[PDB]
Design a protein around this ligand. Structure first.
Ligand SMILES: CCCCCCCC(=O)OC[C@H](COP(=O)(O)O[C@@H]1[C@H](O)[C@H](O)[C@@H](OP(=O)(O)O)[C@H](OP(=O)(O)O)[C@H]1O)OC(=O)CCCCCCC
Ligand SMILES: CCCCCCCC(=O)OC[C@H](COP(=O)(O)O[C@@H]1[C@H](O)[C@H](O)[C@@H](OP(=O)(O)O)[C@H](OP(=O)(O)O)[C@H]1O)OC(=O)CCCCCCC
Ligand SMILES: CCCCCCCC(=O)OC[C@H](COP(=O)(O)O[C@@H]1[C@H](O)[C@H](O)[C@@H](OP(=O)(O)O)[C@H](OP(=O)(O)O)[C@H]1O)OC(=O)CCCCCCC
Ligand SMILES: CCCCCCCC(=O)OC[C@H](COP(=O)(O)O[C@@H]1[C@H](O)[C@H](O)[C@@H](OP(=O)(O)O)[C@H](OP(=O)(O)O)[C@H]1O)OC(=O)CCCCCCC
Ligand SMILES: CCCCCCCC(=O)OC[C@H](COP(=O)(O)O[C@@H]1[C@H](O)[C@H](O)[C@@H](OP(=O)(O)O)[C@H](OP(=O)(O)O)[C@H]1O)OC(=O)CCCCCCC
Ligand SMILES: CCCCCCCC(=O)OC[C@H](COP(=O)(O)O[C@@H]1[C@H](O)[C@H](O)[C@@H](OP(=O)(O)O)[C@H](OP(=O)(O)O)[C@H]1O)OC(=O)CCCCCCC
Ligand SMILES: CCCCCCCC(=O)OC[C@H](COP(=O)(O)O[C@@H]1[C@H](O)[C@H](O)[C@@H](OP(=O)(O)O)[C@H](OP(=O)(O)O)[C@H]1O)OC(=O)CCCCCCC
Ligand SMILES: CCCCCCCC(=O)OC[C@H](COP(=O)(O)O[C@@H]1[C@H](O)[C@H](O)[C@@H](OP(=O)(O)O)[C@H](OP(=O)(O)O)[C@H]1O)OC(=O)CCCCCCC
Ligand SMILES: CCCCCCCC(=O)OC[C@H](COP(=O)(O)O[C@@H]1[C@H](O)[C@H](O)[C@@H](OP(=O)(O)O)[C@H](OP(=O)(O)O)[C@H]1O)OC(=O)CCCCCCC
Ligand SMILES: CCCCCCCC(=O)OC[C@H](COP(=O)(O)O[C@@H]1[C@H](O)[C@H](O)[C@@H](OP(=O)(O)O)[C@H](OP(=O)(O)O)[C@H]1O)OC(=O)CCCCCCC
Ligand SMILES: CCCCCCCC(=O)OC[C@H](COP(=O)(O)O[C@@H]1[C@H](O)[C@H](O)[C@@H](OP(=O)(O)O)[C@H](OP(=O)(O)O)[C@H]1O)OC(=O)CCCCCCC
Ligand SMILES: CCCCCCCC(=O)OC[C@H](COP(=O)(O)O[C@@H]1[C@H](O)[C@H](O)[C@@H](OP(=O)(O)O)[C@H](OP(=O)(O)O)[C@H]1O)OC(=O)CCCCCCC
Ligand SMILES: CCCCCCCC(=O)OC[C@H](COP(=O)(O)O[C@@H]1[C@H](O)[C@H](O)[C@@H](OP(=O)(O)O)[C@H](OP(=O)(O)O)[C@H]1O)OC(=O)CCCCCCC
Lengths: 48, 48, 48, 48, 48, 48, 48, 48, 45, 47, 48, 47, 47, 47, 48, 48, 48, 48, 48, 48, 48, 48, 48, 48
């Protein structure tokens, strides 16, 4: 069972590396964040 | 804009109608559930 | 669930990053904006 | 002036004709509803 | 509140982005213009 | 070389013949109505 | 050369035979009328 | 409804844009010209 | 040879003799029914 | 109505555009030529 | 946001529904099991 | 095979294996390799 | 409404209703009408 | 075929056969099946 | 409540009327035969 | 060539794989069963 | 529930009726032949 | 010299890779098997 | 086994019927040719 | 020009890189092998 | 095994058939020419 | 190696065919010009 | 006007930040070096 | 004045960066090599 997921509302650029997307997701009260594989979107995750 | 989303862990088959996927997601402590477009998965949603 | 969606009327080009589409949607009396997955269109959103 | 659009949360089955989807959308405080052409979803619309 | 629709009689090329189709429709006494997704036609709209 | 068209909101079933679709469109303040070719929808038309 | 063509505005039924479709076209200020191949529509023709 | 139409006799190739087919129709004593949807033919329209 | 649909034929073309006479009145040499649409198709040189 | 139609005999290729079939069909002593939509046959026509 | 993952060694066929793969993974000392999206493989998951 | 999971601690792009392998051992894994296309640091440990 | 079934005894194309109605009554039905498009003799009787 | 009629008690859209078959049995029919395109619950019984 | 269906192997033409197709199906030890709606095929039926 | 086929009367769900529909058809005194192409129906077959 | 199928090598035109396709298939050492539903191809069949 | 073709009677799942379908077709006394592009069916082949 | 395939090099037009493409492929020392379904290409086949 | 082409009969899974597909095709008496662009199949090539 | 390829600099229109594009590439000192699949471009090829 | 690329400053409309775009780039002191695949822009190239 | 653009020929790895790409482009006789949005390519820019 | 393109025959891995693809292309008697945009293939270029 993976965590929930919602695209970041504060991430401005194109998700290349994981640490930058995690930093923006933590502002949105998420526990982690990673880049989408194809569209390169910053996806925030949290235990649901 | 959306809310937190995750695939259903308890949905048995193909998601075609919404009520069967909604009832499975509410049992998983979610608020709603809808069918994915192509693979017809039962995606559970809840406010983040 | 999701918010109410509509395509932007003032967005100039191709939706590649979020900030250019969010600002164009906010000027259209919306609350947020994001890019369409394939056609890369600026989609304006706001709570129904 | 296109309306804002969102998929119905209450329409159970597959959208084939307009009246059943329009009934579920108007019940959700929307002004109209129509079927998607390929996937046959019930899309609710209301002015915005 | 869905608007009517008629293909533009003045659009000289292929509907690739929205602004040039919106401007060509306003000159035809229409209120909005959008591109058809497949054939890339400029479709004008107005309240009806 | 066409009129402004929009799908009917009151037509109950499948558009097979023209009169039943034309009557529902004139009631909707349109001038004429015809069946769509493939999906068999009642399309209301009126001069732009 | 080939005659100009337009679908009949006043044909009530399904274009099964040519005599009934031809009579309706002449009442619409046309010279002849024939049934379409697939969708069984009453097409009206006149010199051009 | 619609205007009486007939395929152009002088348009040289494939109908891609509207003005090139429109000009070939006005030279054939017509008022407008548009491209057919799938076969991409130059169709000449004029008021009946 | 050349082919054209009949304008004088009143109904569905089931047999050939009814369509053959209707085409001869149209100054054609023969008339036969289409395979599927059951139309009276006149033929002439 | 319609004009008398017959498949062209000189033109042996596949009817892609209208001008090539309209020209070669006339050289068979007809008045017009066009392409069939599906089979792309050069169909001759005359009154 | 994801657990430790490996393809099942005891799942015979192609993963279509979740219950068949989940039962095979638990017998392999795993906590869950889900189908891959494209290749439809039975992937077993357990907390790292 | 082993149990696989993407590294939570690798900072950049997985260019070579040793840097990702060390970062996975600090996450209590036994090995790590680069993803073939996206160049991610995937940690591996025996299940 | 009534229960519907295509006539098994009607010989040809359903052009007018009375010929199809007579054939349906012989099949222990109450009425029969021609279909819109295919012109079939469809029998009707109360379920 | 058997005498068919659309169900007057089936509320939604016919997708699977069991839910429509039960509605037709309550309507004094023997079986029920979905229409192929419109997905309507058709009730069948021996004429 | 249908019977066992199989397409005729002896019908030589297009299934226009039913008596010609029913006769050819009886020679194939089938009890009945009817025309298919769209493709106009001779379909032979018999109790399963 | 083909066998006599009739849609299954006891198949509860939707035909994705052959074994589930084959067992339902053998249960109905048929010899084999397969999934239809589009509507995913379970079709029972047996030698005529 | 079907026989082995391969398209005819010698069928000259469009498969409209069955006997012309069956004749060309039997000469090609097949037992039967029928038309393809849409593309109107002559398909030869023989027991595998 | 194209081989004859028939759908597999024994292949359970959905044809994604060739080895699973080739193995099932070989057990059915066919020489080869492959996946269909769109519907992902297992099709067996052997010399006619 | 399946035959080796290569597109025809001498076929002049658009592949509609099989005999024109088969004759062209045999003129190139292939054994058979067929028309591709969508783009209508003349494809030659020959045992590898 | 282009070589004769046939899908590999022995390639295990998804064609990501070329050398794994080349080695399998050379073993099958072909000269080279490359991956199909979308479906990622191993295609064996050799002079016709 | 594909030849060295470059788009034609002199081909005027949309590549439909091979001879017109092949003739233009021979003028440009190439050995062969074919039409691209989707965009219908004239691509000149020659041995590397 | 690769040349530099800049959009044409003088190309008026939409890049459908290559010859018009290549000629417009030579007037801008470039060596070649070609259309973009999707946006149909006239991209000029010359040795950088 | 717009500056010419070309991918770097000496930048050895994947770009993430701008300064490393600018230094590589200036060595290649360019005036600036920015990195592509998605593919992370070091693109060199200089006035045409 | 563009060059001729051909995919590398000897590039073993995924085309991530350009210098590795250039080396593989120069060994194949090409002048330069770059990575493809979507499929990340090593394309070799040389003057025609
Ligand atoms: C040439 C253009 C062609 C269009 C290319 C289509 C462009 C395209 O592929 O991106 C679209 C997007 C995928 O985008 P992307 O890969 O970046 O995002 C992934 C995707 O959302 C998965 O569904 C997620 O897994 P899950 O759901 O949480 O389990 C995954 O989350 P995670 O696992 O990483 O945490 C995400 O990374 O998905 C679609 O909408 C289907 C499009 C339908 C395309 C239908 C094609 C048959
Ligand atoms: C590249 C093509 C493939 C892309 C696949 C990408 C799959 C995917 O993500 O859904 C998109 C589409 C849904 O089609 P569908 O007609 O049901 O839904 C329409 C679609 O969402 C349009 O984008 C909407 O317009 P817009 O957004 O407001 O502008 C339109 O709203 P409106 O007109 O009523 O206002 C909707 O009706 O699906 C496919 O194209 C093929 C399905 C594949 C499986 C087919 C199974 C039958
Ligand atoms: C091959 C591409 C397929 C993608 C779909 C193609 C993309 C798409 O949007 O489809 C619309 C199509 C239209 O069908 P339909 O004939 O009913 O509607 C016609 C269509 O809107 C034309 O564009 C209209 O002309 P125009 O615009 O005013 O000039 C015409 O009006 P008029 O001329 O009579 O006045 C209308 O009659 O319906 C499907 O095929 C859905 C089948 C889905 C099957 C549902 C189950 C899966
Ligand atoms: C791939 C594109 C083709 C399909 C989509 C095409 C959809 C579309 O564009 O509508 C046109 C067609 C109307 O068919 P229909 O036979 O009623 O009308 C004919 C048609 O309009 C021809 O184009 C006319 O010739 P032309 O143009 O004036 O020279 C001809 O005039 P005439 O010369 O006889 O007097 C008319 O008779 O409708 C379908 O094909 C639906 C079949 C699908 C039904 C569903 C089947 C599953
Ligand atoms: C195989 C099944 C075919 C049966 C279906 C064939 C049915 C058929 O023959 O119609 C032509 C249609 C394409 O015609 P196309 O879309 O270009 O032209 C439209 C068509 O004529 C409509 O009927 C018109 O509406 P209406 O009627 O006046 O109201 C419409 O007028 P308008 O709206 O623009 O003003 C026209 O735009 O189909 C094909 O030929 C595709 C060939 C596929 C390629 C295969 C051949 C290589
Ligand atoms: C059916 C048709 C078959 C042909 C379609 C062939 C297209 C194709 O299938 O590719 C996808 C394939 C497997 O995809 P598939 O969706 O089955 O498996 C997913 C994939 O392994 C992800 O990487 C996993 O996420 P993550 O990494 O752990 O975060 C995910 O785990 P989880 O989300 O469940 O936790 C898995 O479900 O993997 C490739 O990249 C091959 C190179 C692609 C081609 C590269 C082109 C350059
Ligand atoms: C192939 C493309 C062209 C189609 C031409 C092919 C010819 C064609 O159009 O077939 C029509 C055929 C029968 O139509 P037909 O008019 O003969 O008979 C009517 C039909 O059975 C309706 O379903 C009934 O409605 P309902 O019982 O009251 O609910 C009606 O009952 P009633 O009211 O009289 O008592 C009957 O009269 O219906 C199909 O199978 C759907 C085909 C899909 C149509 C394709 C849509 C594009
Ligand atoms: C979802 C997209 C929207 C729908 C788009 C497609 C719209 C469309 O195709 O309509 C089909 C619909 C009936 O289709 P549908 O499959 O739902 O209903 C079947 C139909 O009534 C047959 O006639 C019945 O057989 P029969 O008669 O007893 O022998 C059959 O009974 P059974 O075998 O199950 O027991 C029924 O299941 O009604 C029309 O025919 C209108 C003519 C349409 C063409 C009009 C041309 C003028
Ligand atoms: C995805 C779009 C759908 C098209 C897919 C095509 C779907 C397909 O493969 O069937 C062919 C279809 C049916 O033809 P047709 O009406 O002659 O045959 C009927 C059909 O087999 C039904 O399934 C039968 O009911 P059931 O099964 O026993 O319950 C019915 O038996 P019954 O009830 O009378 O006893 C039969 O009458 O005709 C076309 O070609 C559509 C034009 C397609 C050409 C498209 C371009 C013009
Ligand atoms: C538009 C026309 C649709 C008519 C489809 C009518 C129903 C139908 O026939 O489906 C088959 C087709 C392709 O499906 P698919 O690729 O899985 O199967 C192939 C197809 O049957 C070809 O016809 C075969 O070649 P041939 O015949 O031996 O020459 C080929 O065999 P081979 O070459 O490998 O040996 C098969 O692999 O699917 C669709 O077009 C629409 C599905 C999209 C989803 C539908 C949802 C609505
Ligand atoms: C969207 C459907 C529209 C109809 C498309 C009908 C389906 C269809 O056309 O398949 C082919 C396509 C591409 O296949 P793919 O790219 O893997 O393989 C290429 C393809 O075979 C080309 O035809 C080859 O060129 P050519 O012939 O030698 O000149 C080329 O050879 P080369 O260049 O490498 O040397 C091959 O690489 O695969 C799909 O999209 C399946 C989507 C369905 C997936 C269903 C998943 C559920
Ligand atoms: C669905 C997306 C639509 C397909 C997109 C298909 C588009 C395509 O084929 O290549 C473009 C893109 C490269 O993106 P990338 O950002 O690296 O390169 C940009 C591109 O060159 C633009 O043209 C430049 O803008 P402009 O012209 O000078 O104004 C821009 O330079 P600048 O502005 O910074 O100076 C460059 O950054 O590649 C992919 O999409 C990766 C495929 C992964 C996803 C595959 C898609 C399924
Ligand atoms: C229309 C949908 C896509 C059809 C693809 C049909 C075409 C096809 O199969 O390959 C194209 C593309 C690979 O593109 P890729 O980026 O790898 O390679 C580029 C491509 O070959 C261009 O055509 C080249 O330009 P040109 O031609 O020389 O001018 C360009 O040369 P250069 O500029 O670098 O020097 C190359 O870099 O593959 C997909 O889009 C699959 C994405 C997912 C699609 C799968 C959807 C299910």
């Amino acid at each position: 069972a993976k965590d929930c997921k919602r695209e970041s509302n504060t991430f401005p650029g194109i998700c290349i590396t994981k640490p930058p997307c995690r930093k923006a997701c933590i502002r949105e009260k998420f526990t982690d964040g990673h880049c989408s594989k194809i569209l390169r979107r910053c996806l925030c995750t949290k235990p649901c």
